[model samples]
Target: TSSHTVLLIQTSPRLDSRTWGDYESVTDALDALCKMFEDFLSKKSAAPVTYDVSQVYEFLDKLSDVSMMIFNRETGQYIGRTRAWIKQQVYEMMR
Candidate 1:
């Protein structure tokens, strides 16, 4: 079992409803994650950079299952191969 949980409980029928471009669902999740990271840093004695770097490595390590999926949804490129593709991105981000 995991020791910690990050919950993003969203309510609404359509999570992404923007005219210009809507990735609002994932954008909201990223916002919450950033807030949680800030809170975590504030409660720690270590420097913000230290905590952020550690979290980045941890996130990259976990990207096997919970990774990003880049779909141009606009261009429709790299559709089916997205899972592994995004994992590679996360790996590169860590380095």
Candidate 2:
């Protein structure tokens, strides 16, 4: 069984809609990620799943720049990476 359950919470509605605007795009990205994971798991393979986040790099970029908080499944482990870190990873993946 997988040990991770990614949850994407949209917190822009209460913060500043003027600045953040609609977060539907981000939600779409998260949905895509979830779908990919589901597909990976459905394969019933022994290999560890690897996601290509480059497809949603733009949305992920917007998220990494803001006060976004990513929680790792039910664990308390949070993403402490910077925007540059996010960009770098996506860049490498896209290449």
Candidate 3:
């Protein structure tokens, strides 16, 4: 039996709506995705999850000035690839 259950929550409605207007974009999606995954695994599993993306947003806002690039696109791709890679890596790590 599994020892824990990880629950991933898409707290943002922008996930599928590009025109959602409020904090709805690829970067937000990536950050939210990461936060949700972490929250799911690191959380107690009995209570709800919460993520204050302000810090991440501020960091990204500054980062955007330097790299002249957006994190959403890269982060979104990473999230997808990471998930696939993790499925493989987790099995290897466990073995």
- Which candidate should be chosen as best, given lDDT against the real structure? 2
- Which RMSD values do the candidates have, in order? 11.3, 11.8, 15.8
Q: What C-alpha lDDT does candidate 1 achieve relative to the native structure?
A: 0.39
lDDT of 3 at 49: 47
Better of 1 and 3 by lDDT: 1
Among these predictions, the greatest TM-score belongs to: 1
- How far off is model 1, as Cα RMSD? 11.3
TM-score of each: 0.32, 0.30, 0.24
Give a tens-digit lDDT track for model 3, residues 1-95. 11111213233344542221223333443444345345554554656644444433333332211111122443342222223333343334323
Model 1 Cα lDDT, one tens digit per residue, 1-88: 1112222222223555211222334344344445544565577676555554556545434332333333444565523323344335
- Which of 1 and 3 is ahead in TM-score? 1
Clashing pairs in 1: none
Between prediction 1 and prediction 2, the one with superior lDDT is 2
List candidate 2 stretches off by more than 4 Å.
1-15, 18-64, 67-76
Find the 10 residues in a row with the least total lDDT in model 2.
17-26
Q: Is 2 or 3 the stronger prediction by lDDT?
A: 2
lDDT of 3: 0.33
Model 2 error, position 93 (Å) = 1.2
